[PDB]
Symmetry: C3
Subunit: 176 residues, 3 copies
């Protein structure tokens, strides 16, 4: 179906979690409560784990992976996502770390080692370089991304609103 | 199966429409005649509707959605939507070619007879003048299209129409 | 399980120890050499022309592979090649031991020579030739510098790792 194993590892699911039947979730993947996985999304936590916080939405066509533990990269790079996170359509997340209340614009690519602090907004089609740290409360855009400006109080609030909205849209589908 | 409902909203399909079994069409999605939806495509018309004109092709990997809660998705006729194209709450005229891998954001407006180079990013609320070539991330007006090119736009739609009628048969 | 689809009279040619995720779509004249690994939600369409993928080459999750439209040109990928996540390949040619950075787009007629590295999210324009032994980055790509010996070695290690990971999935299945 949608949940697949890798070695002895199997996805750990929370409450009210949605995972479209057209998506694929493999290995050590943890989905906290109210997480919604939309259509044609792939989350492969095989060579390392993928942890996703509560009320976080992974939108249509997104792709999530990690990097294996190697010689110069003994720790490898697992994928960690906080709560109230909005991951846009066709986003590419790879071995990075995302705090809480963050919005990753559709079409963006976040590479290994990148760290996105809380209350951050990333413009669509952006590219976040490896080991790039995004300072909290700002808006970044571009390929490679550049810090554009602080977020308005409205925009910060929008981060929470965005997540909630998706939690709701998620529930409407579970209700069908 | 391939057509999913969003409460009381269900896709409306015209004549000779092609939808791959691997693609997902949800909610108020309106497909005119000869529209061809290709492999692994997702079209979501929940919070708002999605309307796609006649003889339009949505190639492999595209993702079509509307403006989150504020703007429906409208695509004209003879429109060629390249592979892995991202269209979000925008408005596309007739005889338009959206280069594969492009991203068109909320409120963007593409007039008729326009060509968008592959891998482009059309920012939010941006309008593209008819008869021009736009390329880049964010796109820039490159130059005007020759009559020959403006013609090639219609021929692309035509070719893909035959292309989808072929999959429908053999 | 129905990943293999035909197109007219053309049908996929599969080699040895080849993996194709059940969520992926392979259509028409697609030829997969030994140890090739087709990952989740990938689409490979060899209808108006064929697709040839050399041995030990990996096509990562969400990639889109197609050939040139009539107006063609087949898609040819060498051996020990590493095609990154969500990469778009279209009527181009890739030599042996090449790593295509995730999110990149390679257009019609592009020719990538052996031992090459393309940065993530790059765009290779039509008929563009990528010279052997270099790193290319950007949209559109620019020749940055020669790959070091370690980097070249890295190309082989990458293909090797994906061949193993592929077999682990083949193991869990069978
Ligand atoms: Zn990866
Ligand atoms: Zn959307
Ligand atoms: Zn194509």
């Amino acid at each position: 179906d949608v949940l697949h194993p890798y070695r002895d590892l199997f996805p750990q699911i929370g409450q009210r979690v949605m995972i479209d039947d057209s998506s694929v979730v493999i290995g050590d993947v943890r989905l906290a409560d109210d997480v919604g996985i939309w259509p044609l999304v792939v989350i492969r936590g095989d060579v390392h784990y993928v942890q996703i916080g509560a009320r976080t939405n992974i939108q249509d066509g997104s792709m999530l992976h990690v990097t294996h533990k190697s010689s110069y990269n003994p720790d490898g790079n697992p994928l960690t996502i906080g709560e109230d996170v909005t991951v846009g359509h066709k986003v590419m997340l790879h071995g990075c770390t995302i705090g809480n209340r963050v919005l990753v614009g559709m079409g963006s690519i976040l590479l290994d080692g990148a760290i996105v602090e809380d209350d951050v907004m990333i413009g669509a089609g952006s590219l976040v370089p490896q080991n790039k740290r995004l300072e909290s409360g700002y808006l970044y855009l571009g390929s490679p991304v550049k810090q554009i400006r602080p977020l308005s109080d409205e925009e910060k609030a929008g981060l929470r609103y965005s997540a909630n909205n998706y939690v709701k849209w998620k529930d409407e589908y579970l209700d069908q």
